[PDB]
Design a protein around this ligand. Structure first.
Ligand SMILES: [Zn+2]
Length: 1400
């Protein structure tokens, strides 16, 4: 009784002493006995509460303390639970559940204060027990121990549990809801969430956020599980008789939660918005406000999903209704900050929906909208299409109205956010996201400065929202945009702000790593612009080797794209910077030239865009899944694609490849046509005009310029923009992109005028361009100063404006050469040289061009005649040094036209003083564009791979595979290593034309003979001093071709035949003039040497005497080569040699040479050998093979010297089977009469091609690409007799993809001919065939009139196919030229490309 109760105090003291002894002592199984003792004490406490009648508060506090001690002991036990004590924790939790039921009963009738104190202690004990149980994964036990609490909690009216701790209430509720979700209680979890909401009802909605989030989570789990009844059981029906305003707020919060989740939620949001519309009234301006907000949300939902049938409303109609409602609303002073940014969101989504409608309409419009003799210009015609009228259907004046919405939204948001006071908008998150989308859209439409304004505002929001990741992201974007414009200094402050803000994040999230990598990449870029390349390479290498760059995610892909662009920027630097050690480290990654990196970046961008919006946008032949960041990323990817295309087009146009540049330009034009943006269209049209100018197509360029003028006059809401003042605010002057387009327009117009011969107008226009560029730069500087407000004009602002000025200076100086008398522009060379010298590693090719102009100006002939040893019967030091420093500038990536001029001019200057250097320079000036294309093709093959022959071929062709030092020590070392690799018994001859004027054809021929174990031999032949110049021969050849075309179209055949005979006589005269008037006595350099001893002895003896005779440079090899053919030497050529080499005592030299020829007469036996001819773009047209002296030798022509070495490498690695085993006359595929325009050819060649062995053929129709595919890859002999080479079926790009393993006999009109458009190098299918690795290629050089090509084909085929086991094809090729009636008109057409090929 009372004494026992008094003893119960002593018992409690003893229990406290035991607990002190049991402190940190896990009772384990003895916890059960402790709980039994506690249950006895609880019975005693019930008896005391009966006796209590702080009468009972003291006993309640004692019981609470005992329960707290028991809870602490159970928490320790669960901390040391492991596998076993969990079972003991079950009994402990049963006892604790009995105690919790007792505590809940005691908490009843707690009146006040204790109702928040005793119930608070009960809640704390329950929370501790629940944490211990749930942490032990005892979901069922925790649910059982927590069921009594929330059940009565939720059931009780709002008065109960008043002002209870929301966190404590959340803690139990969150634990129970999480346990239900993990167990998948489904309905039970939803009802518990309902009780959670009911209990917390009298409070502000931020406390309701977590329940709502849990409701959305459980609903979406039901969604993955296929449940829909829960989704039907929405908040409206669930909450039932609740206050409508709270229900509307809860539905809005649920809508935002559904926007957050990463799943497709179109229908759920539609249901929520419809329910919001039903709840809202339409008799109160607050109702109008709610209706407008719901309408803009409905517009967001409908702008991407198709729900028209069940809504009977369009996005535009809904958004216009919302706009009218918003404009009608009269606000209240405290809530104006919501009407602002409500209007802004509405206008922005209006713009987005109108753009989407335009895109869909254009896609549908474009989708439903859908026999010349030579095929030289087939790919050009195929590339070109008719879409210029679409541009007229493109520049509608609705664009100003469309952009007005975005401008007004920006203005309203600026007014909202500028003021210092914290914004009162309910959700700043959505404002920040919409600001990001607006900035992306502004970038996409080529309005950069306005986009920067938005980004500054986004950072302001990040500070208010205290979210550190977005501050770093926005600062990185700001720095990237600032550097793209060309302001180096203003990038650094924002970069440092990003670096400072980066620190406040956990160092394990992907965000931290991505931001750190981006900042390091930006630092590397900033070093590149500030001449710190040495550590920039280190930073770039550390970024590249980092394994986290390869993680599969869309955010990392854009970082990879930017890294690739920076790699391309680094790969465009002269070898003086860095060092040898870092160069192969950089090249070891797998990118050897900037264009390779740019192409990889473009491919990555296309792959990214493929994953986001399908593929209908890019080309004509899924769902968007708006997810948050996807909306921003779409516009970002489109803008990046456009910028990458612009860079690629500019670089490829500069290099000298025009076909690829035109392809990229047309693709970009199509893309800009679909989106309906005139500003980008104008820039790409101007670039296309510039590309067309280089091909000499004046009218097409003029049409494109007219289109540019029409578009410029369309958006401006002799052209008028030339008269603008230096300072202006018009749309053309306010924006830098438009200013760049306008400045390019005048350059292209001046180029066209100069081409047409209208001089003195092009100079006038180019003066305008030169004057205009710096003033535009200064206006851009002022504009950037106003926006960013640092109030300090930042250093310099280099940009694309610099390149425009450089090219303008180049063209002005080049025009200066042709008119030497005008002093006013004779200082432009100096001015441009100073201007370029300022930016050394940025305008190097332009510096090289200006230096070449300076050298040719100082040229003022016999000036180069003291370096060679044959004269036809110090300034040099300065020219050599200047040309050397110009050569080292562009060696790493030379333009295809300036390199040849530099190389051949320097080779002329050096002369026989350094034979090795002269030979290297002459060899390094032929077929450079082919070398670039082969490097790109090799990279494509190697990338397809995931090899050793490919690696060695890459080393042989790379521009940087050499050591360091002076000029030309590494060049000579590499050249000697190449020379040691020459196959035996092969003599290589290079014929190139030395051009003085960099636009015309010269009159100097350079000849080089390269041989194994022999020093190189070089010589120069001037042809301007004698009649019958080289240009005379070229003009006569062109005249003969045009006369043949004229004579082809006639009716009477008498005149036809007479004209044909006269033309044949003219061609014979031309062929004779080639040998007897151009080469002269030096025909012997193209003949095989001698192996019998005795010519060497005679050469040595003659050398000793001729040294005294007056030979300025004595060479034994020259005499050996000339005397190896002593039999064919005529008296006149002997006189020419003696007079040229020996001007001191010509008479004695003539006598000695005559005696030497007499001694060597007869005892000459030239033997097996092979000659390779390397010709430049102008000499390739002439038939060198049909000279009388060369009509007895095997001759083939190759694009360059490195190709022979590549053939040797392939033969050593045993890839090519033809040059190892021999063309087998069993695998033949012939194409006869694709389109039936020929009749007699079929009749003649049908039987001759039918009755054979293994001759698969197709005759009558056009072969499908698969057949020719397998006929070129797998067969051995491919023959085509149709008109043209066949580019209609197998275009060059299809050929490049293959491996060529056959010999192609193309018997068509101009099959082997290379098209020379302007100053560009030759282009043809033969080049692609050689790139694919063709052992031999045969084709005609000029157009043929048929009926004699028949006889030539018959003779050649019969002879070579009936030869026998094995014979050289070149012998029968030379023997078959006598069959036709016209021996020089049709017999001289065929030529051979490749290496000699024989049968088994
Ligand atoms: Zn203006």
């Amino acid at each position: 009784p009372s004494p026992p109760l008094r003893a119960l105090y002593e018992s409690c003291q003893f229990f406290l002493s035991g607990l002190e002894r049991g402190t940190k002592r896990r009772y384990r199984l003895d916890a059960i006995l402790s709980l039994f003792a506690f249950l006895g004490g609880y019975c005693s406490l019930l008896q005391q509460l009966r006796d209590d009648g702080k009468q009972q508060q003291s006993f309640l506090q004692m019981y609470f303390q005992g329960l707290h001690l028991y809870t602490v002991v159970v928490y320790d036990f669960a901390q040391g639970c492991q596998i076993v004590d969990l079972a003991d924790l079950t009994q402990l939790v049963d006892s604790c559940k009995s105690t919790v039921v007792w505590m809940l009963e005691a908490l009843e009738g707690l009146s006040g204060q204790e109702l928040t104190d005793h119930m608070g202690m009960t809640a704390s004990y329950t929370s501790n027990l629940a944490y211990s149980f749930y942490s032990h994964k005892l979901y069922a036990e925790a649910c059982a121990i927590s069921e009594p609490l929330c059940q009565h909690l939720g059931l009780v009216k709002p008065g109960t549990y008043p002002e209870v701790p929301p966190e404590k209430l959340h803690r139990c509720f969150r634990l129970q809801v999480e346990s239900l979700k993990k167990l998948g209680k489904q309905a039970q979890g939803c009802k518990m969430v309902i009780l959670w909401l009911a209990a917390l009802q009298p409070c502000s909605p931020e406390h309701m956020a977590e329940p709502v989030t849990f409701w959305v989570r459980v609903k979406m789990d039901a969604a993955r599980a296929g449940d829909k009844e829960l989704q039907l059981k929405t908040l409206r029906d669930s909450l039932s008789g609740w206050d409508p305003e709270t229900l509307a707020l809860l539905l809005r919060e649920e809508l935002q939660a559904y926007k957050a989740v990463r799943a497709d939620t179109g229908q759920e949001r539609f249901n929520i918005i419809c329910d919001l519309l039903e709840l809202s009234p339409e008799e109160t301006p607050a109702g109008a406000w709610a209706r407008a907000t719901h309408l803009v949300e409905l517009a967001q939902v409908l702008c991407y999903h198709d729900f028209t049938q069940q809504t009977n409303c369009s996005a535009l109609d809904a958004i216009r209704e919302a706009l009218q409602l918003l404009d009608s609303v009269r606000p209240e002073a405290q809530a104006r900050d919501q009407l602002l940014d409500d209007k802004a969101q509405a206008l922005l989504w209006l713009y987005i929906c109108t753009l989407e409608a335009k895109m869909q309409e254009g896609i549908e419009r474009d989708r439903r909208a859908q026999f010349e003799v030579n095929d030289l210009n087939y790919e050009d015609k195929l590339q070109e299409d008719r879409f210029l009228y679409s541009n007229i259907a493109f520049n509608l004046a609705a664009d100003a109205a469309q952009s007005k919405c975005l401008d007004q939204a920006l203005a309203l948001w600026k007014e909202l956010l500028t003021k210092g006071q914290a914004p009162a908008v309910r959700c700043l998150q959505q404002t920040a996201a919409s600001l990001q989308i607006l900035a992306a859209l502004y970038q996409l439409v080529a309005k950069p400065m306005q986009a920067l304004e938005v980004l500054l505002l986004l950072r302001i929001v990040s500070e208010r929202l205290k979210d550190h990741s977005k501050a770093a992201g926005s600062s990185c974007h700001i720095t990237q945009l600032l550097l793209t414009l060309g302001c180096p200094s203003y990038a650094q402050l924002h970069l440092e702000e990003a670096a400072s803000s980066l620190k406040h994040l956990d160092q394990t999230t992907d965000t931290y790593l991505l931001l750190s990598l981006t900042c390091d990449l930006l630092r590397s870029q900033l070093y590149w612009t500030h001449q710190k390349v040495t550590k920039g390479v280190s930073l770039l290498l550390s970024v590249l080797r980092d394994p986290a760059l390869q993680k599969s995610s869309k955010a990392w892909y854009l970082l990879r794209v930017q890294v690739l662009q920076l790699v391309a920027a680094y790969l465009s630097l002269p070898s003086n910077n860095l060092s040898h050690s870092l160069w192969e480290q950089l090249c070891a990654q797998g990118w050897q030239t900037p264009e390779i990196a740019l192409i990889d970046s473009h491919k990555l961008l296309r792959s990214i865009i493929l994953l986001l919006m399908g593929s209908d946008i890019l080309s004509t032949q899924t769902s968007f899944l708006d997810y948050g960041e996807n909306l921003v990323q779409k516009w970002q990817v489109l803008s990046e694609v456009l910028s990458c295309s612009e860079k690629l087009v500019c670089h490829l146009g500069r290099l000298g490849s025009v076909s690829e540049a035109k392809a990229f330009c047309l693709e970009a034009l199509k893309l800009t046509t679909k989106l309906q943006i005139p500003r980008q269209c104008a820039l790409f049209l101007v670039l296309k005009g510039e590309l067309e100018l280089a091909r000499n197509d004046i009218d097409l360029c003029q049409s494109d310029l007219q289109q540019v003028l029409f578009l410029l006059e369309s958006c401006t809401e002799i052209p008028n923009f030339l008269s603008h003042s230096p300072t202006c605010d018009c749309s053309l002057c306010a924006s830098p992109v438009l200013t760049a387009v306008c400045l390019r327009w005048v350059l292209v117009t001046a180029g066209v005028r100069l081409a047409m011969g209208h001089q003195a107008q092009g100079l006038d226009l180019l003066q305008v361009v030169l004057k205009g560029c710096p003033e535009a730069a200064e206006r851009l500087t002022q504009a950037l100063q106003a926006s960013l407000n640092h109030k300090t004009p930042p250093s310099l602002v280099p940009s694309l404006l610099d390149e425009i000025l450089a090219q303008a200076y180049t063209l002005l100086a080049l025009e200066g050469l042709n008119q030497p008398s005008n002093e006013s522009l004779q200082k432009v060379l100096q001015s441009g040289l100073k201007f370029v010298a300022a930016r050394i590693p940025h305008l190097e090719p332009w510096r090289a061009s200006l230096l070449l102009i300076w050298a040719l100006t100082k040229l003022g002939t016999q000036l180069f005649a003291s370096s060679w040893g044959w004269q036809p019967p110090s300034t040099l030091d300065s020219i050599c040094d200047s040309l050397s420093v110009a050569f080292r500038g562009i060696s790493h990536c030379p333009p295809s036209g300036l390199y040849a001029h530099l190389c051949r001019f320097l080779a002329l200057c050096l002369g026989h003083r350094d034979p090795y250097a002269t030979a290297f320079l002459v060899t390094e000036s032929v077929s450079i564009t082919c070398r670039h294309q082969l490097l790109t093709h090799l990279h494509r093959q190697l990338s397809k791979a995931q090899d050793v022959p490919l690696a060695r071929i890459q080393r042989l062709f790379s521009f940087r595979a050499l050591e360091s030092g002076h000029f030309p020590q590494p060049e000579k070392e590499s050249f000697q290593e190449r020379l040691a690799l020459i196959p035996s018994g092969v003599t290589v001859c290079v014929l190139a034309l030395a051009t003085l004027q960099p636009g015309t054809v010269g009159n100097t021929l350079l000849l080089t003979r390269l041989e194994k174990d022999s020093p190189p031999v070089s010589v120069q032949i001037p042809t301007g001093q004698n009649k019958l110049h080289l240009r005379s021969v070229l003009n006569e050849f062109d005249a003969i071709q045009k006369a043949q075309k004229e004579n082809s179209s006639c009716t009477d055949k008498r005149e036809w035949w007479t004209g044909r005979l006269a033309l044949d006589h003219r061609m014979e005269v031309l062929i004779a003039s080639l040998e007897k008037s151009v080469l002269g006595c030096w025909k012997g350099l193209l003949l095989p040497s001698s192996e019998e001893p005795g010519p060497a002895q005679e050469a040595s003896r003659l050398q000793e005497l001729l040294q005294d005779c007056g030979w300025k440079y004595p060479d034994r090899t020259l005499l050996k080569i000339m005397l190896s053919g002593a039999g064919a030497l005529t008296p006149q050529d002997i006189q020419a040699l003696a007079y040229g080499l020996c001007p001191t005592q010509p008479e004695r030299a003539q006598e000695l040479l005559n005696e030497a020829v007499g001694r060597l007469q007869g005892l000459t036996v030239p033997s097996n050998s092979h000659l390779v001819l390397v010709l430049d773009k102008d000499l390739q047209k002439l038939p060198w093979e049909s000279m009388p002296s060369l009509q007895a030798l095997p001759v083939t022509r190759l694009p360059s010297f490195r190709f022979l070495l590549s053939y040797s490498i392939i033969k050593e690695y045993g890839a090519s089977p033809v040059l190892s085993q021999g063309v087998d006359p069993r695998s033949t595929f012939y194409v006869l009469n694709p389109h039936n325009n020929l009749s007699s050819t079929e009749e003649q060649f049908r039987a001759n091609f039918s009755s054979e062995a293994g001759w698969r053929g197709v005759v009558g129709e056009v072969p499908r690409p698969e057949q020719v595919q397998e006929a070129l890859t797998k067969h051995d002999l491919y023959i085509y007799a149709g008109h043209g080479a066949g580019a209609r079926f197998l275009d060059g790009q299809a050929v490049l993809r293959l491996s060529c393993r056959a010999v192609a006999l193309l018997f068509g009109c101009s099959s082997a001919a290379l098209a020379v458009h302007g100053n560009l190098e030759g282009a043809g299918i033969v080049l692609k065939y050689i790139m694919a690795g063709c052992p031999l290629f045969l084709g005609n050089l000029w157009d043929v009139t048929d009926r004699d090509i028949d006889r030539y084909t018959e003779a050649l085929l019969q002879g070579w196919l009936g030869a026998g086991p094995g014979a050289p094809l070149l012998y029968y090729v030379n023997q078959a030229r006598q069959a036709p009636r016209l021996k020089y008109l049709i017999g001289a057409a065929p030529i051979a490309y490749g290496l000699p090929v024989s049968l088994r």
